[PDB]
C-alpha cells in the first residue's frame, strides 16, 4: 500500500491526491485495506480466468 | 475635557473590530494550509485565492481603521 | 498493536472482515436466493508450505458456511 | 520520488531483453478496460456512468443520475461532476436512481470510487436487493450477536461487524415504499 | 595544573552527552550533492567552520536556565530568572547573537514600506524571548504567594489541627501548583533554547564551496 | 576494580567555580552606587551624628514581626516634617 | 561516632526500610502506596503550616484574612486590618501582657 | 457637551460589529480554499459563490457602518 | 441632556448584534462553497438554501436594526 | 431622567443576544447546505428539520426581544 | 440589559445542536426521528440555561 | 446582571455536546444508550459551572 | 461606599471567565461522545481522559472563583 | 477611594481572560479523547502531548492572573 | 486630567483586537500540524504558507498596536 | 487620582486579549494531539511545528502584556 504504491504515483505532486478519502482512518490505512481487496479480486479473477482457459 | 476624552475611549473600543478580522484571517490562512496539503498541484492557485480572501477580509479591517481615524480626527 | 480500524487493530485483515460481512448478509437472504448464495460461500481448497524445496506440511479446507468468524 | 518509470508500455521493451525472443509479451489488465480515470470526458451532463460490481456479478454498468452510497461517515449522494472520492462504505443501502424509478441494493461494505472523469465504481462483496431479504431472521441473529461477546479479541471485531450489519439492516427494511 | 580524573559513563557525563546531542540535532548539517570522500572533506570541514556553535550555545542556555529555574523550587531560594534584568537579559542576548551572526554574513551593514513591518516583528522577538521566561517564573511564584496567604487564613482563624477538611483541599491545591511549577521550570528552559536554535539557525546558512573541477567517469 | 579509586578523591567543586563566585561577588560589590538604603553624606555629618541617628527605621525591619511594619530601630527624631 | 559515618548509616536505614506505610499497618485504609505519598505530602504541608503559625501565634497577619478572627480577639491588634493602627494597639497590649 | 461626547463612545462600540463580519469573511474565503482544493475544475464557479457571499456578508458590514455614521452625523 | 447622550451609546451597544450575524453569514456562505465543491450539479439548489438561510439570518439582523432605531428615534 | 437614560443603554446591551442567535442560524443554515450537498435526496426532510430548528432558536431571539421591550416600555 | 446577553450563547449553542440534527439526519435518514428524540431532549436541557438567564432578568427587575 | 453572562458559555457548551450526541448516535445507533450516559454526565459536570456562576449571583445579591 | 459597590461589580465581571470553562467543557465532553461512537471498545478509557481533562479545566474555574473569593472577601 | 475601588473593577475585568484559556483547554483535552480513540496504542504518548500542551496554555492562565494580582496588590 | 485618564482605558479596549489575532493564529498553526500530518513530503512548503499567513495576520496585530501607540502617545 | 484609577481599569481591559491567545493555543495544541494520532511517525516533527506556533502565538500574549505594563507603569 505505501511500500511502493503511493511511491509510484507521486510525481510533481501525486496521482492519488485527487481523491477525497472518506475512510475511517488514514489514507495510508485505507490503502492497506484497498490493496488486499485488490489482491483478492485479481486472484479470484486469475483462478477463474485460468479455470475457464 | 469630556469630549476630547471620549475621542480616546471611543476610538479605543472602536478597534475591537480587528479581533474578528484577525480570527477570520487565521481560519482562512489555515484553510490554505490544509488545502495545499490535500493537493500540492493547486498550491500556487490557492494562494491566489488566499490573497483574494486576504485583501477582501482586510477591507473590513480598513473599514474599521477609517472610523478610528474618523472618531479621532473628524 | 496495529493502528487503524476495528478489524485491523484486532489483527484481522480487511479481506477477512469484508467476507465476514459478506457471509452474514447471505444468512439473512430469501430462501429461493439463500441456497444459491451458499454456493458462492463455500471454501474448498488446501495449502502446503515449501520451506526447503520439496518438503510438506499443509492446511486443508472443507468449509461450507463461509470464511471462519473465529481467530485464525 | 520517481525511481521506477513503470507501466505496460515500458514492460514490453525491457522484457525483450531478458526473455527469449520467441515469446510475445504477456497481456496486462490495462489492455482490457477502455474507461480510465484521468481521461477527460464521460460525464455527458445529467447522467453519469455507474459501475456497480460484485465479485460474482456486474449488477449495473449503465448510467444513473444519482447514487446514494452508504459511506462510513454517513449516506452521501453522487451527482455527475462529483469530486474525486475514495469512499469506504458501511453495510448499507446503495440506491441507484435513474429518474423517477430507483433500485435499492443493500450491500455488505466495500469501497466506492468516484474517478475524476465522473465514473462511479462501486465495489462491494455481497450486494443483495432488499426484495430477497427477509426481516424475520435478521433480528434472530442480531439478538444472538447482542448476547455473545467473549474476551476473544478476534471475535471483538467479528461480533462488532455482526452487530453493525444487522442494525443497519434492521433500519433499512422499515422505510420501504 | 593537574586536572581531575573522570569515571567513564558517569551520570552527568551521560546526561550532558544526550543534552548536547539534542541541541546539536536542532540545526543539522545539510547533505551535499556530491559523495563525501577525501575530495569533499575540506568542503565539509569548512562547512562546519562557518556554522555557528548553536549546539554549544543552546546547551549553555539550557543548562543555565534550568539551573536558575529550578533554584526557585528549592527551599529558601528564588529563581534568578524571576528577575527582569536576568531573564530578559538572556533573551536580548540570544536575539543579539542571532543578529550579529546575521549581520556578519555580509560586511556588517544593516538590512519598500514592507521592511519596517518585518523588522518590528523581528525586533519584538528580542523582548518576547526574555519576557516569556520572566513572566512564567514570576506569575507562577506570585500565584503561589497569594494562595499561601489564603490557605494560611484558615488555620490562623480556625483551630490549629482543627477544621482540617477546609485546609486539606487548599494545601493540595498549593501542592499541585508547586508541581506545575516544576513543569514550567523545565519547559521554559526548553522553550527558550528551542527558540534560540530557531532564531540563530535562520542565519546559519552559507555556500557550500565544493569541487570547482572534476575528473568524471 | 576501580571503585575504590573513585572513592579516594572526595567532593570537589566544578573546575572554575572560584571565577564564578568572584564574578558574581564583584558585580554585587562594585555597583558604583551606595549600598541600597543608604546615602553618602559628608564627613562633617558622619563625625557629628550618633550611630543611632545614622540608622533609618526602614533598613532594620523586625526579625519576626508581630505587626507588619515593625522596625527594630527608630533613628533620628529630628524629622524635617 | 565518626560524624559523617554514623548518621549517614542511620539516615540510610531511616530512608529505605523504615516505612510507616507498613510498620503502622495502614494498607487497611489506603489503596496504593502512590496515594500514601500523595497525602503524606499534603500531610507534611498541613503540619508545616500549623507549626509555622503556632510557633508565633499572636501576630497580626500580613496575609489578608477573609473577615475572620482567631479566637477571643475580634477587636484587638491581632485582627486589626490597619497596620499602623495595630502597631499602636500591640504596644499597649505588650505592657499589660 | 456629553451628547457629542457620547457620539464618540457610541460610534466606537458600534463598529465592533465588524469583528464578526471579518470572522465571517475568513470562514467564507477559507472554505473556498478547501473547496477549490477538492475539485479545481469548479474553482472558477466557486469564486462566483464567494463573491456572492462576500457581497452579501458585507451587507452586514454596511448595515453597521450606516449606524456608525448615523450616530456621528445624525 | 444625559437622556439624549444615552440614546447614542445605547445604540452602539445595540448594533454589536451585527457581529454574530456577520459571523454566521460567512459560515453559511462558506459552507455553500464546500457544498458546491462536492456535487456541483446541486450548486444552484444549494444557493436556494443559502438565500433561504440568508433571508432568515438577516431576519434577526434587522430585528437588531429595528432596536437600534427604536431607541434612537422612538 | 436618569431612569429614562438607563432604559436606552440597557436596551442596547439587551439586544447583544441577537449576535448569538444570529450566528446560530448561520451555523444551522450552513449545515443545511452541507447536509443537502451530501445526499440531496433528503433535501426536503432537512428543511423540515431546519425550519423546525429555525423557529426553535428564535425562541431565544424573542426572549431577547421580550426584555428589550420589557425594560423599554415597562 | 446585561443579564440577557447570556441568551447569546444559548442561541449559538442551539444553532449548533440543530445544525447537527441536519447533518445527523443526512447521514442516516432511517434514524432521523430518533435523533429528534435526542435533539429535543438536548433542547430541553439547553433552554434550562435560557430560563436561568431569564430567572435572573426577572429577579433583578422585580425582586 | 453582568455576572450571569457566564451562562452564555454553558449555553454554547451544552449545545455542542448535545450536537455531538446527534452526530454520535447517527454513526452507530446501538451505542446511543451508552452515549447519553456520557452526554448527561457531561451535562451534569458542565452544570456545576452553571451553578458556580449562579452561586455567586445569589452571593453578590444575597450576601 | 464606592469600595463595596465596586467589589460587587468587579466580582460580577470576574465570573464571566466561567463562560470559557463552561464552553470548553462542552467541546471536551462532546469529543467523548464522538470518541465513543467511533470505537466503543475504548470508551471506558476515554472517560479516564475526560475526567482528567475535566479536572484540569476546572482548575481555571478554581482560579476564576478564587478571584471572585478575593475581590469580595481582599 | 477612587483608586482602591478601581482595582476591584479592573482586576475583575482582567480575569475574564481566563475564559478563552478554559475554552482552549477544552478543545485540546477533547483532542486527547479523539486522538486516543483513533489509535489507542499511542494513548500514553498523547497524554504526554496533552500535559505539555496543558502546561503551556496554563501559562496563559497565569499570565492573566499575574495582572489580576499586580492590579489588586501592586 | 480626564483626557489623560481616558487614554489609559481607551488603549486597554484597543488592544483586545489582539485576542482575535491570538485565536486566529492558533487555527492557522493548528492547520499546519494537521496539514503536515497528511503529507510530510510538502511540509517544507506548508511552513512557507504558515509563515506567510502569520505575517499577514500579525499585520492585523500591529495595526491595532498602532492604534494603541497612537492613543497613548499621540 | 482619576488617572491612577483609570490605569487599573485600563490594564484590566487590556489583558482580555489573553483569552484569544489561550484559546488559539489550545486549538493548535489540539492539532498536535490529533495530527500525531494520524501518523505518529512524524511526532517529533509536529512538536517542532507546535512550538514554532506556540512561540508566534504567545508572542501576541506579550504584545498584550506589554500594553498592560505600559498602561500601568508608564
TrEMBL record, chain A:
Organism superkingdom: Eukaryota
Coiled coil regions, renumbered to chain: none
Subcellular location: Mitochondrion inner membrane
Family classification: Belongs to the ATPase gamma chain family.
The protein, known as: F-ATPase gamma subunit
Lineage: Eukaryota, Viridiplantae, Chlorophyta, core chlorophytes, Chlorophyceae
From TrEMBL, chain D:
GO cellular component term of the entry, any: proton-transporting ATP synthase complex
UniProt entry keywords in alphabetical sequence: Hydrogen ion transport, Ion transport, Membrane, Mitochondrion, Mitochondrion inner membrane, Transit peptide, Transport
Residue ranges annotated for the ATP synthase F1 complex delta/epsilon subunit N-terminal domain, each copy included: 50-120
Keyword Disulfide bond carried by entry: no
GO molecular function: proton-transporting ATP synthase activity, rotational mechanism
Subcellular location: Mitochondrion inner membrane
Sequence similarity: Belongs to the ATPase epsilon chain family.
PANTHER family in the cross-refs: ATP SYNTHASE DELTA/EPSILON CHAIN (PTHR13822), ATP SYNTHASE SUBUNIT DELTA, MITOCHONDRIAL (PTHR13822:SF7)
Protein name from the UniProt record: Mitochondrial ATP synthase subunit delta
The species this protein was found in: Polytomella sp. Pringsheim 198.80
UniProtKB/TrEMBL annotation, chain E:
Residues that coordinate or bind Zn(2+) 1: 78, 141, 145
GO cellular component terms, A-Z: proton-transporting ATP synthase complex
Chain residues that bind Zn(2+) 4: 145
Regions crossing the membrane: 54-72, 84-103, 112-135, 142-161
UniProt keyword list: ATP synthesis, CF(0), Hydrogen ion transport, Ion transport, Membrane, Metal-binding, Transmembrane, Transmembrane helix, Transport, Zinc
Alphabetized GO MF terms: proton-transporting ATP synthase activity, rotational mechanism
Residues involved in Zn(2+) 3 binding: 141, 145
Topology term for the membrane: Multi-pass membrane protein
Compartments, as annotated in UniProt: Membrane
Sites where the protein binds Zn(2+) 2: 141
Keyword match Lipid metabolism: no
Broad class of where this protein is predominantly found: membrane
Binding partners and assembly: F-type ATPases have 2 components, CF(1) - the catalytic core - and CF(0) - the membrane proton channel. CF(1) has five subunits: alpha(3), beta(3), gamma(1), delta(1), epsilon(1). CF(0) has three main subunits: a, b and c.
Similarity section: Belongs to the ATPase A chain family.
Job of this protein: Mitochondrial membrane ATP synthase (F(1)F(0) ATP synthase or Complex V) produces ATP from ADP in the presence of a proton gradient across the membrane which is generated by electron transport complexes of the respiratory chain. F-type ATPases consist of two structural domains, F(1) - containing the extramembraneous catalytic core and F(0) - containing the membrane proton channel, linked together by a central stalk and a peripheral stalk. During catalysis, ATP synthesis in the catalytic domain of F(1) is coupled via a rotary mechanism of the central stalk subunits to proton translocation.
Protein name (Swiss-Prot/TrEMBL): F-ATPase protein 6
Organism: Polytomella sp. Pringsheim 198.80
TrEMBL record, chains K, L:
Subcellular localization(s) per the UniProt record: Membrane; Mitochondrion
Positions of the V-ATPase proteolipid subunit C-like domain: 1-60
Top-rank taxon, per record: Eukaryota
Transmembrane segments: 1-23, 35-62
Coiled-coil segments on the chain, per record: none
Homology family: Belongs to the ATPase C chain family.
Protein name, entry field: Mitochondrial ATP synthase subunit c
Source organism of this protein record: Polytomella sp. Pringsheim 198.80
Residue numbers of the full-length protein present here: 65 to 127 of 127
Amino acid at each position: 500500500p505505501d511500500l511502493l504504491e503511493k511511491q509510484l504515483e507521486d510525481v510533481t505532486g501525486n496521482s492519488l491526491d485527487a481523491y477525497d478519502i472518506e475512510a475511517s482512518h488514514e489514507r495510508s490505512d485505507v490503502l492497506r485495506d484497498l490493496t488486499e481487496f485488490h489482491l483478492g479480486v485479481t486472484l479470484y479473477n486469475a483462478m477463474l480466468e485460468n479455470n475457464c482457459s | 475635557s469630556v469630549l476630547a476624552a471620549s475621542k480616546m475611549v471611543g476610538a479605543g473600543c472602536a478597534t475591537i473590530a480587528l479581533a474578528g478580522v484577525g480570527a477570520g484571517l487565521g481560519v482562512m490562512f489555515g484553510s490554505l494550509i490544509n488545502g495545499a496539503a490535500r493537493n500540492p498541484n493547486i498550491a500556487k492557485q490557492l494562494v491566489g485565492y488566499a490573497l483574494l480572501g486576504f485583501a477582501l477580509t482586510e477591507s473590513i479591517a480598513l473599514f474599521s481603521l477609517l472610523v478610528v481615524f474618523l472618531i479621532l480626527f473628524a | 498493536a496495529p493502528s487503524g480500524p476495528f478489524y485491523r487493530v484486532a489483527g484481522m485483515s480487511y479481506l477477512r472482515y469484508s467476507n465476514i460481512c459478506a457471509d452474514l448478509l447471505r444468512n439473512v437472504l430469501k430462501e429461493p436466493f439463500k441456497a444459491k448464495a451458499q454456493a458462492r460461500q463455500a471454501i474448498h481448497f488446501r495449502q502446503a508450505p515449501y520451506v526447503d524445496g520439496k518438503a510438506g506440511a499443509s492446511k486443508v479446507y472443507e468449509l461450507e458456511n463461509g470464511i471462519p468468524k473465529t481467530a485464525n | 520520488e520517481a525511481a521506477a518509470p513503470a507501466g505496460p508500455k515500458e514492460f514490453t521493451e525491457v522484457w525483450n531483453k531478458k526473455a527469449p525472443s520467441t515469446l510475445i509479451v504477456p497481456e496486462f489488465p490495462s489492455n482490457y478496460t477502455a474507461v480510465k480515470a484521468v481521461g477527460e470526458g464521460q460525464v455527458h451532463g445529467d447522467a453519469f456512468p455507474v459501475n456497480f460490481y460484485t465479485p460474482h456479478s456486474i449488477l449495473s454498468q449503465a448510467q444513473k443520475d444519482t447514487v446514494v452510497l452508504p459511506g462510513v461517515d454517513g449516506y452521501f449522494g453522487v451527482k455527475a461532476s462529483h469530486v474525486p472520492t475514495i469512499a469506504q462504505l458501511k453495510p448499507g443501502v446503495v440506491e441507484l436512481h435513474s429518474g423517477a424509478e430507483s433500485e435499492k441494493f443493500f450491500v455488505s461494505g466495500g469501497f466506492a470510487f468516484v474517478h475524476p472523469n465522473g465514473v462511479t465504481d462501486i465495489c462491494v462483496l455481497e450486494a443483495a436487493t432488499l426484495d430477497q431479504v427477509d426481516p424475520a431472521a435478521v433480528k434472530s441473529a442480531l439478538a444472538a450477536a447482542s448476547a455473545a461477546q467473549p474476551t476473544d479479541e478476534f471475535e471483538q471485531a467479528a461480533n462488532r461487524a455482526a452487530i453493525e450489519l444487522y442494525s443497519a439492516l434492521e433500519s433499512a427494511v422499515e422505510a420501504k415504499a | 595544573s593537574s586536572v581531575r580524573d573522570v569515571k567513564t559513563g558517569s551520570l552527568p557525563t551521560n546526561f550532558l552527552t544526550g543534552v548536547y546531542r539534542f541541541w546539536r540535532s536542532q540545526n543539522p548539517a545539510e547533505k551535499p550533492h556530491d559523495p563525501v570522500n577525501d575530495r569533499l572533506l575540506p568542503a565539509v570541514v569548512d562547512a562546519s567552520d562557518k556554522r555557528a556553535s548553536i549546539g554549544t550555545w543552546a546547551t549553555t542556555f539550557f543548562c543555565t536556565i534550568i539551573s536558575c529555574n529550578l533554584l526557585g523550587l528549592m527551599p529558601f531560594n528564588e529563581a534568578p530568572t524571576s528577575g527582569l534584568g536576568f531573564a530578559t537579559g538572556l533573551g536580548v542576548s540570544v536575539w543579539a547573537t542571532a543578529t550579529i551572526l546575521g549581520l556578519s554574513k555580509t560586511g556588517f551593514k544593516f538590512p519598500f514600506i514592507f521592511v519596517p513591518l518585518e523588522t518590528i516583528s523581528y525586533t519584538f522577538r528580542a523582548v518576547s524571548l526574555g519576557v516569556r521566561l520572566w513572566v512564567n517564573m514570576l506569575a507562577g511564584h506570585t500565584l503561589l504567594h497569594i494562595l499561601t496567604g489564603m490557605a494560611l487564613a484558615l488555620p490562623f482563624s480556625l483551630g490549629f489541627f482543627s477544621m482540617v477538611p477546609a485546609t486539606f483541599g487548599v494545601c493540595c491545591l498549593l501542592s499541585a501548583l508547586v508541581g506545575l511549577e516544576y513543569l514550567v521550570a523545565v519547559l521554559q528552559s526548553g522553550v527558550f533554547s528551542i527558540l534560540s536554535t530557531v532564531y540563530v539557525g535562520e542565519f546559519n546558512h552559507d555556500k557550500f564551496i565544493g569541487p570547482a573541477a572534476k575528473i568524471v567517469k | 576494580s576501580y571503585s575504590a579509586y573513585f572513592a579516594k578523591a572526595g567532593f570537589q567543586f566544578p573546575a572554575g567555580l572560584s571565577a564564578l563566585v568572584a564574578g558574581i561577588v564583584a558585580l554585587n560589590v562594585c555597583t558604583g552606587r551606595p549600598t541600597k538604603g543608604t546615602k553618602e553624606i559628608s564627613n562633617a555629618e558622619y563625625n557629628a551624628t550618633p550611630i543611632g541617628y545614622l540608622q533609618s527605621p526602614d533598613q532594620h525591619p523586625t526579625a519576626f514581626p508581630k505587626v507588619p511594619g515593625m522596625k527594630d530601630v527608630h533613628g533620628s527624631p529630628h524629622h524635617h516634617h | 561516632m565518626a560524624v559523617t559515618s554514623f548518621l549517614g548509616k542511620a539516615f540510610e536505614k531511616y530512608f529505605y526500610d523504615f516505612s510507616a506505610y507498613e510498620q503502622f499497618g495502614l494498607n487497611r485504609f489506603l489503596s496504593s502506596k502512590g496515594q500514601y505519598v500523595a497525602l503524606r505530602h499534603v500531610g507534611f504541608v498541613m503540619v508545616g503550616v500549623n507549626v509555622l503559625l503556632a510557633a508565633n501565634f499572636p501576630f497580626n497577619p500580613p496575609f489578608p484574612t477573609i473577615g475572620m478572627c482567631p479566637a477571643g480577639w475580634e477587636g484587638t491588634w491581632v485582627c486589626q486590618a490597619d497596620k499602623a493602627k495595630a502597631l499602636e494597639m500591640y504596644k499597649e497590649w505588650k505592657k499589660s501582657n
